[PDB]
Design a protein around this ligand. Structure first.
Ligand SMILES: Cc1ncc(C[n+]2csc(CCOP(=O)(O)OP(=O)(O)O)c2C)c(N)n1
Ligand SMILES: Cc1ncc(C[n+]2csc(CCOP(=O)(O)OP(=O)(O)O)c2C)c(N)n1
Ligand SMILES: O=C(O)C(=O)Cc1c[nH]c2ccccc12
Ligand SMILES: O=C(O)C(=O)Cc1c[nH]c2ccccc12
Ligand SMILES: [Mg+2]
Ligand SMILES: [Mg+2]
Lengths: 536, 536
């Protein structure tokens, strides 16, 4: 077992922050998996299918800052395509390792299984190009620096990368590196940074009331602490949108609720849109986040900070790291921001469900909500400190959270994980619940059983049968997907019953599945505003 | 409800032979679905996820000759990518309809859900190019002739196509066509056909013993009856490989078993490889079908017929439709081939399981077997007449069989469907069993419970943990995935119990799930040869 390319990749992978590798084995990657098994630093996590594995890697990376997925050539990697695309869309650094047939077999154009039967072995590599920031076909002549290049780009951009690893290349001799892979964040040219500072210094100097709006890019680039410390040292009205929920302790002074354009609470609209200067840090104004692009923020009103560039008014300042821009604005806020913000039921409904959940969440919780009434209602939760709130409203692939929850719980075995998934969404990835049980995880899984696609019903055709789903027996799924599930399941239709059940499962001694019975047409306030925006 | 592009596409869909549309709804395709519901010729079949829907469409198309899949932009289509790729690899005409945001939204580059957040709306269209024979983005200016062009190419090549249908385009006015879309077989240039005929006649005229080897391209191009009548009117030794199993009644004189290269039975090797002239009709010598490319057939020994070209010896004759080449060979064979063939246990093992299943299969069965010991053991079944045998050994995506069975049963509600899936494979697509139960299907599902991936164990690392799977409670899955399942499940560990249970379920009164307990290391004969070939 001499040190080889397979070991080098695992060594670099652990340097980047991944301690687990998710995926599904295949004959093209079994020999690589031996090194995964033998490594003391990386733990193999076999998944029930590749799509769920890619979702789990995404959720893992939202907890540890990095993740890796292993699939087999062809059938495996294409199954994971939707997961990698979601990671690219929402800036999640997931490494996709594809175990591939040996280079000799590829060069001969053999009619191998998991190919299109044409002797071409690069179709799927090229198909992955639009959803990765970097990719490589590893060869005996390039392996170690292509591994380092792809991973470094992933770290810089916080987006997926792709490595094709032929079985023969994986065994090629390598040398253990003396230096661990690190990025060492870059610095702007001092004249460019000064130009941004001077324009920002001027703009803040004439600001009467300043507000701060931060979102998911600060989460991806490890700037959560900086934004939290920013608002302590300089108290001002601040919010996030749905994607960036969890950046701020929502109990803190100056927070009035999540910003969702015209669907925001009145206090939030006045806090953010009513300020004459709004600092937008890592924001992307998507249709869902803005309730149909109904946000009212003008270029003159805003200073915007993006990963490699920042904007003051109509002028863009490129080549400025987002951390350096933030550090620059903090200084300036200290110098120019003065203000002090001066701040149960019977039958289950959306309204009393989220109110009941509000009393249940605690600091340290990991909360995942799927597209549907789950995410659109969870936006109204007031998150306490140290909450990781995982939602995917830009890509918006239902089924993500259940599988992502398995990844997040794997990343954080000592934290309480709350899974809010609709009944429709959970069907898409249900087999990963078996993975949860096999690994003895204890998440609190709340299935919003409104018997179908309620969000689709509210958009169009409420009585149309294509908005119906097969009706599952949710509380019996754990006993079907495990020979001995240590799980406790309830079906609840009353709020007091839900509150009592939430008390029982508070300390997550066992996996809990709560089937929440909700009306077919019952709607959270944000989605009602969203549906109203879609008319004309 | 004026006739529009949505109605035109559905009308063309029925012309091609599809009575159902599989998929998963999304906001970008809800208005199109209204026309599917309202259509008297197309039945909407909602699936549990897009990957399964694409597998079901594939299995449907293998029964009706054509199928259609509907997904939503981005999250839907990328989930189905592995299914469409398998359809391309194995030449299955599945039409992928992608409901997309309106053209106005696309041209402004809006930050819409199900995008990468860059305003680009053609990423996924291009990513689908390598796995389709034709694709189009439908516009107001091209819709109806682009629909007809894509479908015609799909019919010509028997391979998937792709249509992007913006919601606004779907509502554009159209006119019902007077004439149904038809292919109208092409004809070879008569001099080109004559040249092939002269070369084939010379070769066959000095053939002492002639044999016929046919495979899956005969199935896809609707030539199963022609091949059957061929060997009836002209008795000779004949076989198929694994992909094309089901072309011939295997009880008939001249059939000695499936051909698998050096893994073939001794009589099969002598019947096919022992002939001085072998007619290879629609054959692709993949690694699995030939047990590691160990087939012994020389160019001078063979005459080969492919969809658009045929070969005699070392000379290729291009531009000849495969139907015309076969008709030429049939005439020549009637003249020049001077031939006449003239011909329970205790504990469950692979050996007695397949012998027990042999006594159970009947004419008219649809049999599906997944990659693993299932497909590799089913190759030894002696199929009676009128059996549709569905296997995917070129693409080889596990999980395909369970979902494709749902599609095949949908296509043929009056036929008995037998599903042979491993425990590993069924985990990948288990939620489609819920679709089976919702639609009151009565397949016979045999789950080969060997507690892990034994095919991978045979290949490499028998005791390695990556070859293990989560252990499910298979007989309890139907009652978890349906509120009132019409099903009966059994668990069997002895050959007599299996035969007894197969006795009970004979007439598919209800959905049957038989959990077959088999040893971890037990291997069917074909897979033993394959692993031996791997040692190279
Ligand atoms: C992979 C994928 N397929 C399809 C969709 C389209 N879609 C978005 S929301 C939704 C329905 C949500 O259903 P459910 O999870 O039951 O939520 P709720 O009823 O609370 O709205 C669908 C089908 C999607 N987002 N992702
Ligand atoms: C989508 C996909 N992922 C992974 C593989 C790799 N693969 C091929 S066969 C196999 C194991 C088959 O397991 P099972 O279905 O239990 O069959 P067995 O050999 O145990 O009967 C695997 C993982 C594949 N073919 N397709
Ligand atoms: O992991 C993979 O590559 C597989 O799908 C396993 C497999 C399915 N069919 C085969 C034929 C020969 C070798 C491996 C496989
Ligand atoms: O079916 C679809 O298109 C969906 O993905 C549902 C959905 C999730 N988030 C949304 C935001 C606006 C409109 C639809 C959706
Ligand atoms: Mg629902
Ligand atoms: Mg198995």
């Amino acid at each position: 077992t001499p040190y080889c390319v397979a070991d080098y990749l695992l060594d670099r992978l652990t340097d980047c922050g991944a301690d687990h590798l998710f995926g599904v084995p295949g004959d093209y990657n079994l020999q690589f998996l031996d090194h995964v098994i033998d490594s003391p630093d990386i733990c193999w996590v076999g998944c029930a299918n590749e799509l769920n594995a890619s979702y789990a890697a995404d959720g893992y990376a939202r907890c540890k800052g990095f993740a890796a997925l292993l699939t087999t050539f062809g059938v495996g990697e294409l199954s994971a395509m939707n997961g990698i695309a979601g990671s690219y869309a929402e800036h999640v650094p997931v490494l996709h390792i594809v175990g591939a047939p040996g280079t000799a077999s590829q060069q001969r154009g053999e009619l191998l299984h998991h190919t299109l039967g044409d002797g071409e072995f690069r179709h799927f590599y090229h198909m992955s190009e639009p959803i990765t920031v970097a990719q490589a076909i590893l060869t005996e002549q390039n392996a170690c620096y292509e591994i380092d290049r792809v991973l470094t780009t992933m770290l810089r951009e916080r987006r997926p990368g792709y490595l094709m690893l032929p079985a023969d290349v994986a065994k090629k001799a390598a040398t253990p590196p003396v230096n661990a892979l690190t990025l060492r964040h870059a610095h702007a040219d001092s004249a460019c940074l000064k130009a941004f500072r001077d324009a920002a210094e001027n703009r803040l100097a004439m600001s009467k009331r300043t507000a701060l709006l931060a979102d998911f890019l600060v989460l991806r680039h490890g700037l959560k602490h900086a934004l939290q410390k920013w608002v302590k040292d300089v108290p001002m009205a601040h919010a996030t949108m749905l994607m960036g929920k969890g950046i701020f302790d929502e109990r803190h002074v100056g927070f009035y609720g999540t910003y969702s354009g015209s669907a925001s609470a009145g206090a939030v609209k006045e806090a953010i849109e009513g300020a004459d200067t709004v600092l937008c840090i890592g924001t992307r104004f998507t249709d869902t986040l803005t309730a149909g692009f109904t946000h009212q923020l003008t270029p003159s009103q805003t200073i915007e900070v993006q990963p490699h560039a920042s904007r003051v008014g109509d002028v863009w300042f490129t080549g400025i790291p987002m951390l350096q821009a933030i550090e620059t604005l903090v200084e300036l806020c200290k110098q120019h921001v003065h203000d002090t913000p001066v701040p149960p039921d019977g039958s289950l409904t959306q309204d009393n469900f989220w109110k009941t959940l509000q009393t249940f969440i605690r600091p340290g919780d990991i909360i995942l909500a799927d597209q549907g009434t789950s995410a659109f209602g969870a936006i109204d939760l007031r998150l306490p400190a140290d909450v990781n709130f995982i939602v995917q409203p830009l890509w918006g692939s239902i089924g993500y959270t259940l599988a992502a929850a398995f990844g997040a719980q794997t990343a954080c075995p000592n934290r309480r994980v709350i899974v809010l998934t609709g009944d429709g969404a959970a069907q898409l990835t249900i087999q990963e619940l078996g993975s949860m049980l096999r690994d003895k995880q204890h998440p609190i899984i709340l299935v919003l059983n409104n018997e179908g696609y309620t969000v689709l019903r509210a958009i169009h055709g409420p009585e149309q049968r294509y908005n119906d789903i097969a009706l599952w027996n949710w509380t019996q799924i754990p006993q079907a997907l495990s020979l001995d599930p240590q799980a406790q399941c309830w079906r609840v239709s009353e709020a007091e019953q839900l509150a009592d059940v939430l008390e029982k499962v508070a300390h997550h001694e066992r996996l809990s599945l709560i089937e929440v019975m909700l009306p077919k047409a019952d709607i959270p306030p944000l989605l009602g505003a969203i549906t109203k925006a879609l008319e004309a």
